[PDB]
């Protein structure tokens, strides 16, 4: 499922629902970033400011990044800056590809009801962090695929890649 104008949400979480430690990933799992890379290249990536800043304000190459903030004067290295959910949606509608929500928690909670696809990496382990995937309405979502992740010297944690589509 990959239509133009589509909104998708992508995240990685541990078994507790931890998605971040003060903007940072509390684990290292190179395969997940690869998965992230695949779903976001040549698309638009939407980030809340805290998440953006946890990435050192560095935009990722080969895609458009939108950063969401209420601060009218916020500016940063080579990203679109937008200031409301409504702004994200207007952009998403006209965009020639997928608008992918990359986080963080606040952004996920308010934008996932507009999304058509969920991509999640479930990491079967627990870590310390302060940011959790939010409570959402799962009743409207349906798991349509799941792939186990490869474990090797570089990837030390059992994990799964899950895709959900909507009921309606
Ligand atoms: N123990 C605790 O205190 C605790 C608990 C949970 C999280 N936190 C923390 O909160 C951060 C990450 O949480 P998060 O994942 O929710 O952050 P995030 O989604 O990545 O980004 C949050 C920010 O994006 C903005 N934003 C979201 N919706 C907007 C809208 N509709 N219009 C305009 N701006 C909007 C805001 O920027 P602006 O602020 O510039 O308006 C907002 O504060 C971390 O730095 C972390 O340490 C701490
Ligand atoms: C993979 C090599 C490096 C690089 C990159 C370079 C060139 C081309 C593509 C990419 C793809 N992204 N790249 C990143 O460093 C990873 C991005 C990233 C993302 C997320 C969010 C995320 C994380 N994971 C998931 N599943 N959802 C997500 N929504 C969080 C991060 O830190 C807080 C990230 O940086 C560590």
Which residue lies with its CA nearest to atom 17 of ligand 2?
33
* CB-CB neighbours of 156 under 10 Å: 13
Q: Give the domain ranges of the chain.
A: 1-168
Residue 51 tokens, joined? 């998440």
Could you tell me if 101 and 80 are in contact, meaning their C-beta atoms sit under 8 angstroms apart? no
Q: How far is the CA of 153 from the centre of ligand 1 (A)?
A: 34
Q: What is the DSSP string of 15-62?
A: TT-EEEBTTB-SS--HHHHHHHHHHHTTSEEEEEHHHHHHTTTPPPTT
The encoded tokens of residue 66 equal 């939108």
Q: How far apart are the CA of 66 and the centre of ligand 2, in A?
A: 15
Phi-psi region of 57 (alpha: psi -120 to 50; beta: other; left: phi over 0): left
Q: Which CATH topology does 1-168 take?
A: Dihydrofolate Reductase, subunit A (3.40.430)
Q: Which ligand is nearest to the CA of 51?
A: 1
Q: Is 1 exposed, middle or buried (0-12, 13-18, 19+ CB in 10 A)?
A: exposed
**From the alpha carbon of 41, which atom of ligand 2 is closest?**
9
- d(C-alpha 35, C-alpha 15), whole Å: 19
Cβ(121)–Cβ(11) under 8 Å? Answer: yes
Distant-in-sequence, close-in-space partners of 99: CB < 8 Å, separation ≥ 6: 6, 7, 8, 43, 44, 46, 88, 91, 92
Relative to the CA of 132, which ligand 1 atom is closest?
Answer: 6
| Residue 60, phi-psi category: left (phi > 0), alpha (psi -120 to 50), beta (remainder) | beta
- H or E segment at 115? none
Resolution (A): 2.3
Task: Kindly state if the Cβ of 130 falls inside 6 Å of ligand 1.
Answer: yes
Give the whole-angstrom CA distance, residue 122 versus residue 88: 26
* Cα pseudo-dihedral 86, 133, 163, 63, rounded to 10: 50
């Amino acid at each position: 499922l990959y239509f133009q104008g589509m909104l998708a949400a992508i995240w990685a979480q541990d078994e507790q629902g931890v998605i971040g430690k003060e903007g940072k990933l509390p684990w290292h799992l190179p395969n997940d970033l690869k998965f992230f890379k695949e779903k976001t290249i040549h698309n638009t990536l939407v980030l809340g400011r805290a998440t953006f800043e946890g990435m050192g304000c560095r935009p990722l190459p080969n895609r458009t990044t939108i950063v969401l903030t209420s601060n009218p004067d916020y500016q940063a290295e080579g990203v679109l800056v937008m200031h409301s959910v409504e702004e994200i949606l207007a952009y998403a509608d006209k965009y020639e590809g997928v608008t992918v929500i990359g986080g963080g928690s606040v952004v996920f909670k308010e934008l996932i009801p507009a999304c058509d696809v969920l991509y999640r990496t479930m990491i079967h382990e627990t870590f310390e962090g302060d940011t959790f995937f939010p409570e959402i309405d799962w009743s409207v979502w349906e798991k349509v695929a799941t792939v186990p992740g490869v474990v090797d010297e570089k990837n030390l944690y059992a994990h799964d890649y899950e895709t959900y589509h909507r009921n309606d």
